[PDB]
Design a protein around this ligand. Structure first.
Ligand SMILES: [Zn+2]
Length: 59
């Protein structure tokens, strides 16, 4: 709804054409694409680590 750079993927999604507020483990975008975007207040990986601490479910 409200793109949250602190929490979300940040990467302007070519589907939706808005930042990527899918999730922190955004299925739309590859790892590099999440990392490339400086959306979060921390690195992507470090941020995803927090995601994994919550939603530690990865495919
Ligand atoms: Zn994304």
């Amino acid at each position: 709804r409200e793109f949250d750079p602190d929490i979300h993927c940040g990467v302007i999604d070519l589907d939706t054409k808005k930042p990527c507020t899918r999730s922190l483990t955004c299925k739309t975008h590859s790892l590099t694409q999440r990392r490339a975007v400086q959306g979060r207040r921390k690195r992507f990986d470090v941020l995803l680590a927090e995601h994994k601490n919550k939603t530690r479910e990865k495919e």
